[PDB]
């Protein structure tokens, strides 16, 4: 009884904050043309992806979890499982894209000016969305309803992303772990480590350095439980579902959803520039 009460409270708290925190960024960045810059085009795409992540994950992964049945249809299960995957991909790739531009600006500034432009920024955003959509297209196809019968002889549904055989399933989750988690894991680490090394070699200097460390660590913290759980259930889903399924995996998936609620905080609301414009856009 205690556990569902602290589940709904935490889920709603991340929800209404993410919803409010992403619509404000989209409003300010679209309306204010002067504010728009190379990095703001990246932040705007990140805000849209986080808002897409919030709307198609949180209510669709909590109400079926509380009621223990998928109350929506099969077409809802397919359409939403595609937008969840796509939004995760765009969010993670925008963070890597911001880090690569940041590395170019600091380590090799003169060379960067020839290529790092606003037109170049739009091309990377266009490539990010078009590649994320293409790679997440197996999600609607392989996710369909699976029915079960309860103790009361009722009918119920489960929306599950299940491949035809476990030989493709283990290779899928291994592929997904590398490109989504592991490759940003060390690319963002080397990019923000060289920037931190070039700035360390006065109290504002040490400010920027430690915030780069918070970006990579909270990237790890948000995505490590769910990606490990996906790797766990790929090779043996009997031990993973016996321990984690139900209330623990709700908290695991919520910590994962928290990334789309802390990304506007650590990228926009901690900016001196963006807060001055946020007070100007709204009366």
């Amino acid at each position: 009884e205690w556990q569902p009460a602290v589940q709904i409270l935490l889920y709603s708290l991340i929800f209404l904050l993410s919803v409010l925190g992403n619509t404000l960024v989209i409003t300010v960045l679209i309306r204010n043309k002067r504010m728009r810059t190379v990095t703001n085009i990246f932040l705007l795409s990140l805000a849209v992806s986080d808002l897409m992540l919030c709307l198609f994950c949180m209510p669709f992964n909590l109400i079926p979890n509380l009621l223990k049945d998928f109350i929506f249809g099969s077409a809802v299960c397919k359409t939403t499982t595609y937008f969840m995957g796509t939004s995760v991909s765009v969010s993670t790739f925008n963070l890597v894209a911001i880090s690569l531009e940041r590395y170019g600006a600091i380590c090799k500034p003169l060379q960067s000016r020839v290529w790092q432009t606003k037109s170049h920024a739009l091309k990377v955003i266009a490539a990010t969305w078009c590649l994320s959509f293409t790679i997440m297209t197996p999600y609607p196809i392989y996710s369909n309803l699976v029915p079960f019968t309860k103790n009361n002889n009722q009918t119920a549904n489960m929306c599950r992303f299940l491949l035809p055989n476990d030989v493709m399933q283990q290779s899928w989750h291994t592929f997904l772990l590398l490109i989504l988690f592991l490759i940003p894991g060390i690319v963002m680490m080397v990019a923000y480590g060289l920037i931190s090394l070039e700035l360390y070699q006065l109290m504002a200097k040490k400010r920027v350095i430690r915030m780069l460390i918070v970006i990579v660590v909270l990237f790890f913290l948000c995505w490590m439980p769910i990606f490990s759980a996906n790797a766990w259930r790929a090779y043996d889903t009997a031990s993973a579902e016996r321990r984690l399924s139900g209330t623990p995996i709700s908290f695991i998936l919520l910590l994962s959803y928290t990334s789309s609620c802390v990304n506007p905080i650590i990228y926009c609301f901690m900016n001196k520039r963006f807060r001055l414009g946020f007070m100007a856009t709204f009366p």
Binding site: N65, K68, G85, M158, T237, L244, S245, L253
Partner: peptide, 8 residues
């Protein structure tokens, strides 16, 4: 029973 979770 309700055993499992969505990937994302």
């Amino acid at each position: 029973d309700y055993m499992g979770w969505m990937d994302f």
